[PDB]
PDB file of all heavy atoms in Angstrom:
ATOM      1  N   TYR A   1     143.557 143.959 109.967  1.00 13.31           N
ATOM      2  CA  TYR A   1     142.842 144.972 110.905  1.00 13.31           C
ATOM      3  C   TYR A   1     143.675 146.070 111.169  1.00 13.31           C
ATOM      4  O   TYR A   1     143.391 147.249 111.062  1.00 13.31           O
ATOM      5  CB  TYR A   1     142.534 144.299 112.218  1.00 13.31           C
ATOM      6  CG  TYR A   1     141.133 143.358 112.091  1.00 13.31           C
ATOM      7  CD1 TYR A   1     141.132 142.158 112.794  1.00 13.31           C
ATOM      8  CD2 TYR A   1     140.130 143.872 111.361  1.00 13.31           C
ATOM      9  CE1 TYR A   1     139.915 141.388 112.700  1.00 13.31           C
ATOM     10  CE2 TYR A   1     138.862 143.208 111.320  1.00 13.31           C
ATOM     11  CZ  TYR A   1     138.796 141.945 112.020  1.00 13.31           C
ATOM     12  OH  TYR A   1     137.672 141.217 111.932  1.00 13.31           O
ATOM     13  N   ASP A   2     144.954 145.984 111.342  1.00 13.27           N
ATOM     14  CA  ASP A   2     146.004 146.901 111.744  1.00 13.27           C
ATOM     15  C   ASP A   2     147.115 146.581 110.672  1.00 13.27           C
ATOM     16  O   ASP A   2     147.186 145.840 109.844  1.00 13.27           O
ATOM     17  CB  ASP A   2     146.467 146.788 113.095  1.00 13.27           C
ATOM     18  CG  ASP A   2     146.758 145.421 113.542  1.00 13.27           C
ATOM     19  OD1 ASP A   2     146.497 144.451 112.819  1.00 13.27           O
ATOM     20  OD2 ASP A   2     147.060 145.125 114.680  1.00 13.27           O
ATOM     21  N   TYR A   3     148.142 147.680 110.762  1.00 12.06           N
ATOM     22  CA  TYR A   3     149.110 147.661 109.795  1.00 12.06           C
ATOM     23  C   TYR A   3     150.148 146.581 110.228  1.00 12.06           C
ATOM     24  O   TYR A   3     150.358 146.021 111.472  1.00 12.06           O
ATOM     25  CB  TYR A   3     149.902 148.869 109.667  1.00 12.06           C
ATOM     26  CG  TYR A   3     150.877 149.031 108.589  1.00 12.06           C
ATOM     27  CD1 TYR A   3     150.375 148.790 107.269  1.00 12.06           C
ATOM     28  CD2 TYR A   3     152.271 149.469 108.763  1.00 12.06           C
ATOM     29  CE1 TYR A   3     151.264 148.940 106.173  1.00 12.06           C
ATOM     30  CE2 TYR A   3     153.082 149.622 107.549  1.00 12.06           C
ATOM     31  CZ  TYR A   3     152.504 149.273 106.376  1.00 12.06           C
ATOM     32  OH  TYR A   3     153.459 149.407 105.301  1.00 12.06           O
ATOM     33  N   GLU A   4     150.855 145.983 109.231  1.00 11.94           N
ATOM     34  CA  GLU A   4     152.091 145.015 109.404  1.00 11.94           C
ATOM     35  C   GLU A   4     151.486 143.781 110.138  1.00 11.94           C
ATOM     36  O   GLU A   4     152.117 143.019 110.866  1.00 11.94           O
ATOM     37  CB  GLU A   4     153.166 145.611 110.193  1.00 11.94           C
ATOM     38  CG  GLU A   4     154.086 146.487 109.445  1.00 11.94           C
ATOM     39  CD  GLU A   4     155.039 147.304 110.338  1.00 11.94           C
ATOM     40  OE1 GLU A   4     155.574 146.815 111.159  1.00 11.94           O
ATOM     41  OE2 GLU A   4     155.022 148.442 110.062  1.00 11.94           O
ATOM     42  N   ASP A   5     150.211 143.365 109.633  1.00 11.61           N
ATOM     43  CA  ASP A   5     149.625 142.127 110.030  1.00 11.61           C
ATOM     44  C   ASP A   5     149.531 141.142 108.846  1.00 11.61           C
ATOM     45  O   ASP A   5     149.641 141.678 107.713  1.00 11.61           O
ATOM     46  CB  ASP A   5     148.392 142.326 110.779  1.00 11.61           C
ATOM     47  CG  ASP A   5     148.023 141.238 111.693  1.00 11.61           C
ATOM     48  OD1 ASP A   5     148.785 140.306 111.835  1.00 11.61           O
ATOM     49  OD2 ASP A   5     146.911 141.315 112.381  1.00 11.61           O
ATOM     50  N   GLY A   6     149.228 139.839 109.082  1.00 11.50           N
ATOM     51  CA  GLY A   6     149.063 138.950 107.884  1.00 11.50           C
ATOM     52  C   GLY A   6     147.957 139.165 107.212  1.00 11.50           C
ATOM     53  O   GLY A   6     148.030 139.475 106.013  1.00 11.50           O
ATOM     54  N   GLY A   7     146.749 138.931 107.800  1.00  9.50           N
ATOM     55  CA  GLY A   7     145.539 139.091 107.113  1.00  9.50           C
ATOM     56  C   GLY A   7     144.423 138.593 108.055  1.00  9.50           C
ATOM     57  O   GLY A   7     144.649 137.609 108.834  1.00  9.50           O
ATOM     58  N   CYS A   8     143.168 138.939 107.865  1.00 10.64           N
ATOM     59  CA  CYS A   8     142.105 138.704 108.813  1.00 10.64           C
ATOM     60  C   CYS A   8     140.787 138.352 108.177  1.00 10.64           C
ATOM     61  O   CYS A   8     140.149 137.310 108.574  1.00 10.64           O
ATOM     62  CB  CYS A   8     141.950 139.845 109.778  1.00 10.64           C
ATOM     63  SG  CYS A   8     143.255 140.003 111.105  1.00 10.64           S
ATOM     64  N   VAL A   9     140.398 139.189 107.040  1.00 11.12           N
ATOM     65  CA  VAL A   9     139.055 139.009 106.615  1.00 11.12           C
ATOM     66  C   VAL A   9     139.026 138.445 105.190  1.00 11.12           C
ATOM     67  O   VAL A   9     139.735 138.965 104.289  1.00 11.12           O
ATOM     68  CB  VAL A   9     138.457 140.427 106.594  1.00 11.12           C
ATOM     69  CG1 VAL A   9     137.040 140.499 106.085  1.00 11.12           C
ATOM     70  CG2 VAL A   9     138.319 140.832 108.030  1.00 11.12           C
ATOM     71  N   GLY A  10     138.261 137.459 104.833  1.00 10.91           N
ATOM     72  CA  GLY A  10     138.025 136.909 103.434  1.00 10.91           C
ATOM     73  C   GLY A  10     138.815 135.755 103.208  1.00 10.91           C
ATOM     74  O   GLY A  10     139.277 135.744 102.043  1.00 10.91           O
ATOM     75  N   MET A  11     139.001 134.874 104.125  1.00 11.35           N
ATOM     76  CA  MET A  11     139.987 133.726 103.859  1.00 11.35           C
ATOM     77  C   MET A  11     139.333 132.663 103.039  1.00 11.35           C
ATOM     78  O   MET A  11     140.107 131.913 102.310  1.00 11.35           O
ATOM     79  CB  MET A  11     140.338 133.185 105.267  1.00 11.35           C
ATOM     80  CG  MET A  11     141.206 134.164 106.062  1.00 11.35           C
ATOM     81  SD  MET A  11     142.812 134.401 105.273  1.00 11.35           S
ATOM     82  CE  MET A  11     143.522 135.526 106.446  1.00 11.35           C
ATOM     83  N   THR A  12     138.037 132.418 103.123  1.00 10.88           N
ATOM     84  CA  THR A  12     137.521 131.176 102.441  1.00 10.88           C
ATOM     85  C   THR A  12     137.373 131.405 100.991  1.00 10.88           C
ATOM     86  O   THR A  12     137.455 132.512 100.477  1.00 10.88           O
ATOM     87  CB  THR A  12     136.229 130.707 103.098  1.00 10.88           C
ATOM     88  OG1 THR A  12     135.769 129.573 102.491  1.00 10.88           O
ATOM     89  CG2 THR A  12     135.225 131.852 102.868  1.00 10.88           C
ATOM     90  N   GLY A  13     137.053 130.373 100.343  1.00  9.85           N
ATOM     91  CA  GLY A  13     136.929 130.259  98.973  1.00  9.85           C
ATOM     92  C   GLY A  13     135.523 130.818  98.502  1.00  9.85           C
ATOM     93  O   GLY A  13     134.525 130.477  99.170  1.00  9.85           O
ATOM     94  N   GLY A  14     135.356 131.675  97.437  1.00  9.96           N
ATOM     95  CA  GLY A  14     134.104 132.046  97.029  1.00  9.96           C
ATOM     96  C   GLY A  14     133.590 133.211  97.481  1.00  9.96           C
ATOM     97  O   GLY A  14     132.594 133.863  97.138  1.00  9.96           O
ATOM     98  N   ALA A  15     134.148 133.771  98.875  1.00 10.30           N
ATOM     99  CA  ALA A  15     133.659 134.809  99.561  1.00 10.30           C
ATOM    100  C   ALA A  15     134.479 136.123  99.364  1.00 10.30           C
ATOM    101  O   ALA A  15     135.589 136.060  99.747  1.00 10.30           O
ATOM    102  CB  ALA A  15     133.365 134.454 100.963  1.00 10.30           C
ATOM    103  N   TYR A  16     133.863 137.173  98.919  1.00  8.98           N
ATOM    104  CA  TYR A  16     134.647 138.418  98.794  1.00  8.98           C
ATOM    105  C   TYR A  16     133.979 139.585  99.338  1.00  8.98           C
ATOM    106  O   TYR A  16     132.790 139.420  99.782  1.00  8.98           O
ATOM    107  CB  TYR A  16     134.778 138.727  97.353  1.00  8.98           C
ATOM    108  CG  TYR A  16     133.710 139.001  96.508  1.00  8.98           C
ATOM    109  CD1 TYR A  16     133.340 140.353  96.259  1.00  8.98           C
ATOM    110  CD2 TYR A  16     132.671 138.142  96.060  1.00  8.98           C
ATOM    111  CE1 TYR A  16     132.273 140.799  95.481  1.00  8.98           C
ATOM    112  CE2 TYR A  16     131.556 138.467  95.449  1.00  8.98           C
ATOM    113  CZ  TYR A  16     131.353 139.767  95.136  1.00  8.98           C
ATOM    114  OH  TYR A  16     130.245 140.043  94.483  1.00  8.98           O
ATOM    115  N   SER A  17     134.601 140.732  99.534  1.00  6.01           N
ATOM    116  CA  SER A  17     134.039 141.907 100.138  1.00  6.01           C
ATOM    117  C   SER A  17     134.217 143.025  99.010  1.00  6.01           C
ATOM    118  O   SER A  17     134.988 142.879  97.934  1.00  6.01           O
ATOM    119  CB  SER A  17     134.846 142.374 101.300  1.00  6.01           C
ATOM    120  OG  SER A  17     136.385 142.182 101.091  1.00  6.01           O
ATOM    121  N   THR A  18     133.407 144.159  99.248  1.00  5.50           N
ATOM    122  CA  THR A  18     133.452 145.211  98.400  1.00  5.50           C
ATOM    123  C   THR A  18     133.713 146.517  99.156  1.00  5.50           C
ATOM    124  O   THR A  18     133.500 146.620 100.281  1.00  5.50           O
ATOM    125  CB  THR A  18     132.093 145.403  97.635  1.00  5.50           C
ATOM    126  OG1 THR A  18     131.079 145.665  98.687  1.00  5.50           O
ATOM    127  CG2 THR A  18     131.629 144.207  96.884  1.00  5.50           C
ATOM    128  N   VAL A  19     134.278 147.645  98.442  1.00  4.69           N
ATOM    129  CA  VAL A  19     134.500 148.908  98.971  1.00  4.69           C
ATOM    130  C   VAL A  19     133.306 149.763  98.517  1.00  4.69           C
ATOM    131  O   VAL A  19     132.817 149.681  97.479  1.00  4.69           O
ATOM    132  CB  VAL A  19     135.936 149.363  98.525  1.00  4.69           C
ATOM    133  CG1 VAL A  19     135.974 149.446  97.054  1.00  4.69           C
ATOM    134  CG2 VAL A  19     136.248 150.770  99.228  1.00  4.69           C
ATOM    135  N   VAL A  20     132.914 150.775  99.400  1.00  5.94           N
ATOM    136  CA  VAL A  20     131.816 151.469  98.947  1.00  5.94           C
ATOM    137  C   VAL A  20     132.138 153.018  99.037  1.00  5.94           C
ATOM    138  O   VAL A  20     131.614 153.740  98.338  1.00  5.94           O
ATOM    139  CB  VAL A  20     130.624 151.323 100.094  1.00  5.94           C
ATOM    140  CG1 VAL A  20     130.271 149.861 100.039  1.00  5.94           C
ATOM    141  CG2 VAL A  20     131.052 151.899 101.467  1.00  5.94           C
ATOM    142  N   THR A  21     133.286 153.532  99.731  1.00  5.50           N
ATOM    143  CA  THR A  21     133.564 154.814  99.765  1.00  5.50           C
ATOM    144  C   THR A  21     134.850 155.051 100.187  1.00  5.50           C
ATOM    145  O   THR A  21     135.608 154.200 100.555  1.00  5.50           O
ATOM    146  CB  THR A  21     132.496 155.724 100.620  1.00  5.50           C
ATOM    147  OG1 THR A  21     132.928 157.031 100.508  1.00  5.50           O
ATOM    148  CG2 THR A  21     132.632 155.218 102.034  1.00  5.50           C
ATOM    149  N   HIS A  22     135.201 156.456 100.167  1.00  5.19           N
ATOM    150  CA  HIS A  22     136.502 156.984 100.843  1.00  5.19           C
ATOM    151  C   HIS A  22     136.135 158.290 101.494  1.00  5.19           C
ATOM    152  O   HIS A  22     135.308 159.043 100.978  1.00  5.19           O
ATOM    153  CB  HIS A  22     137.689 157.275  99.712  1.00  5.19           C
ATOM    154  CG  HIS A  22     138.220 155.898  99.346  1.00  5.19           C
ATOM    155  ND1 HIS A  22     137.675 155.297  98.165  1.00  5.19           N
ATOM    156  CD2 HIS A  22     139.318 155.282  99.608  1.00  5.19           C
ATOM    157  CE1 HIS A  22     138.404 154.327  97.993  1.00  5.19           C
ATOM    158  NE2 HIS A  22     139.441 154.076  98.754  1.00  5.19           N
ATOM    159  N   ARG A  23     136.752 158.518 102.664  1.00  3.11           N
ATOM    160  CA  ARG A  23     136.512 159.755 103.458  1.00  3.11           C
ATOM    161  C   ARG A  23     137.905 160.332 103.715  1.00  3.11           C
ATOM    162  O   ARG A  23     138.640 159.768 104.564  1.00  3.11           O
ATOM    163  CB  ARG A  23     135.766 159.464 104.763  1.00  3.11           C
ATOM    164  CG  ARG A  23     134.313 159.051 104.512  1.00  3.11           C
ATOM    165  CD  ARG A  23     133.595 159.950 103.578  1.00  3.11           C
ATOM    166  NE  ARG A  23     133.130 161.239 104.175  1.00  3.11           N
ATOM    167  CZ  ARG A  23     132.000 161.295 104.872  1.00  3.11           C
ATOM    168  NH1 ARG A  23     131.087 160.411 104.864  1.00  3.11           N
ATOM    169  NH2 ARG A  23     131.624 162.533 105.375  1.00  3.11           N
ATOM    170  N   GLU A  24     138.162 161.410 103.085  1.00  3.91           N
ATOM    171  CA  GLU A  24     139.541 162.081 103.276  1.00  3.91           C
ATOM    172  C   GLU A  24     139.574 162.781 104.697  1.00  3.91           C
ATOM    173  O   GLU A  24     140.820 162.688 105.109  1.00  3.91           O
ATOM    174  CB  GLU A  24     139.746 163.078 102.146  1.00  3.91           C
ATOM    175  CG  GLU A  24     139.698 162.477 100.780  1.00  3.91           C
ATOM    176  CD  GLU A  24     140.862 161.571 100.521  1.00  3.91           C
ATOM    177  OE1 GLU A  24     141.995 161.829 101.165  1.00  3.91           O
ATOM    178  OE2 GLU A  24     140.701 160.639  99.889  1.00  3.91           O
ATOM    179  N   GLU A  25     138.677 163.216 105.284  1.00  4.82           N
ATOM    180  CA  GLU A  25     138.632 163.590 106.720  1.00  4.82           C
ATOM    181  C   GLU A  25     138.786 162.257 107.475  1.00  4.82           C
ATOM    182  O   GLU A  25     138.129 161.211 107.209  1.00  4.82           O
ATOM    183  CB  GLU A  25     137.565 164.419 106.939  1.00  4.82           C
ATOM    184  CG  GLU A  25     136.189 163.743 106.759  1.00  4.82           C
ATOM    185  CD  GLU A  25     135.520 164.129 105.449  1.00  4.82           C
ATOM    186  OE1 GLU A  25     136.367 164.655 104.570  1.00  4.82           O
ATOM    187  OE2 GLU A  25     134.272 164.020 105.221  1.00  4.82           O
ATOM    188  N   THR A  26     139.688 162.256 108.394  1.00  6.27           N
ATOM    189  CA  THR A  26     140.190 161.314 109.368  1.00  6.27           C
ATOM    190  C   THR A  26     140.857 159.972 108.723  1.00  6.27           C
ATOM    191  O   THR A  26     141.087 159.096 109.397  1.00  6.27           O
ATOM    192  CB  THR A  26     139.114 160.723 110.281  1.00  6.27           C
ATOM    193  OG1 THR A  26     138.112 159.909 109.703  1.00  6.27           O
ATOM    194  CG2 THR A  26     138.354 161.959 110.939  1.00  6.27           C
ATOM    195  N   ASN A  27     140.879 159.964 107.466  1.00  3.08           N
ATOM    196  CA  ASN A  27     141.559 158.849 106.617  1.00  3.08           C
ATOM    197  C   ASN A  27     140.968 157.514 106.860  1.00  3.08           C
ATOM    198  O   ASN A  27     141.576 156.568 107.390  1.00  3.08           O
ATOM    199  CB  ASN A  27     143.104 158.788 106.849  1.00  3.08           C
ATOM    200  CG  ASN A  27     143.736 158.226 105.779  1.00  3.08           C
ATOM    201  OD1 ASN A  27     143.583 158.432 104.663  1.00  3.08           O
ATOM    202  ND2 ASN A  27     144.703 157.182 106.159  1.00  3.08           N
ATOM    203  N   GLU A  28     139.595 157.295 106.557  1.00  2.00           N
ATOM    204  CA  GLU A  28     138.931 156.048 106.680  1.00  2.00           C
ATOM    205  C   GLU A  28     138.092 155.779 105.481  1.00  2.00           C
ATOM    206  O   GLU A  28     137.734 156.621 104.797  1.00  2.00           O
ATOM    207  CB  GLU A  28     138.103 156.219 107.927  1.00  2.00           C
ATOM    208  CG  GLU A  28     138.625 155.983 109.332  1.00  2.00           C
ATOM    209  CD  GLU A  28     137.735 156.376 110.438  1.00  2.00           C
ATOM    210  OE1 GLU A  28     136.859 157.217 110.246  1.00  2.00           O
ATOM    211  OE2 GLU A  28     138.111 155.929 111.645  1.00  2.00           O
ATOM    212  N   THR A  29     137.932 154.473 105.306  1.00  2.00           N
ATOM    213  CA  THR A  29     137.144 153.971 104.181  1.00  2.00           C
ATOM    214  C   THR A  29     136.195 152.949 104.801  1.00  2.00           C
ATOM    215  O   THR A  29     136.565 152.145 105.619  1.00  2.00           O
ATOM    216  CB  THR A  29     137.950 153.440 102.983  1.00  2.00           C
ATOM    217  OG1 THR A  29     137.031 152.680 102.153  1.00  2.00           O
ATOM    218  CG2 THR A  29     139.075 152.548 103.588  1.00  2.00           C
ATOM    219  N   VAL A  30     134.949 152.880 104.138  1.00  2.00           N
ATOM    220  CA  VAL A  30     133.925 151.958 104.609  1.00  2.00           C
ATOM    221  C   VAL A  30     133.938 150.727 103.753  1.00  2.00           C
ATOM    222  O   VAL A  30     133.942 150.876 102.444  1.00  2.00           O
ATOM    223  CB  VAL A  30     132.713 152.570 104.662  1.00  2.00           C
ATOM    224  CG1 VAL A  30     131.603 151.679 105.211  1.00  2.00           C
ATOM    225  CG2 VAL A  30     132.596 153.764 105.639  1.00  2.00           C
ATOM    226  N   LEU A  31     134.011 149.417 104.288  1.00  2.00           N
ATOM    227  CA  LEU A  31     134.064 148.275 103.499  1.00  2.00           C
ATOM    228  C   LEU A  31     132.638 147.584 103.611  1.00  2.00           C
ATOM    229  O   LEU A  31     131.959 147.853 104.481  1.00  2.00           O
ATOM    230  CB  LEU A  31     135.140 147.383 103.904  1.00  2.00           C
ATOM    231  CG  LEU A  31     136.471 147.314 103.329  1.00  2.00           C
ATOM    232  CD1 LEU A  31     136.294 146.682 101.868  1.00  2.00           C
ATOM    233  CD2 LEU A  31     137.123 148.663 103.239  1.00  2.00           C
ATOM    234  N   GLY A  32     132.368 146.778 102.688  1.00  2.00           N
ATOM    235  CA  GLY A  32     131.242 145.835 102.744  1.00  2.00           C
ATOM    236  C   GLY A  32     131.497 144.447 102.934  1.00  2.00           C
ATOM    237  O   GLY A  32     132.096 143.750 102.031  1.00  2.00           O
ATOM    238  N   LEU A  33     131.291 144.095 104.125  1.00  4.47           N
ATOM    239  CA  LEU A  33     131.655 142.601 104.501  1.00  4.47           C
ATOM    240  C   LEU A  33     130.867 141.639 103.820  1.00  4.47           C
ATOM    241  O   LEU A  33     129.847 141.923 103.309  1.00  4.47           O
ATOM    242  CB  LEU A  33     131.566 142.506 106.088  1.00  4.47           C
ATOM    243  CG  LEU A  33     132.395 143.473 106.835  1.00  4.47           C
ATOM    244  CD1 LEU A  33     132.339 143.116 108.415  1.00  4.47           C
ATOM    245  CD2 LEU A  33     133.912 143.222 106.519  1.00  4.47           C
ATOM    246  N   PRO A  34     131.301 140.275 103.662  1.00  3.39           N
ATOM    247  CA  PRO A  34     130.540 139.332 103.080  1.00  3.39           C
ATOM    248  C   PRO A  34     129.203 138.900 103.914  1.00  3.39           C
ATOM    249  O   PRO A  34     128.346 138.310 103.268  1.00  3.39           O
ATOM    250  CB  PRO A  34     131.438 138.087 102.956  1.00  3.39           C
ATOM    251  CG  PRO A  34     132.620 138.462 103.844  1.00  3.39           C
ATOM    252  CD  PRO A  34     132.743 139.852 103.914  1.00  3.39           C
TER     253      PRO A  34
END
């Protein structure tokens, strides 16, 4: 979720996420959750 953390999202087997875009203003990207 934040920098220098271990990991939060997508832990189980068989479940993945996808990336949909990038926004150069405000430095944010939108993810597609499982």
Side-chain angles (χ1 to χ4, degrees):
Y1 279 140
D2 39 1
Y3 196 52
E4 280 161 51
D5 206 359
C8 290
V9 175
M11 290 293 178
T12 178
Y16 69 102
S17 42
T18 63
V19 60
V20 303
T21 182
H22 289 82
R23 288 313 275 275
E24 294 295 325
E25 56 270 15
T26 75
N27 202 49
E28 276 166 339
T29 169
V30 180
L31 264 294
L33 298 182

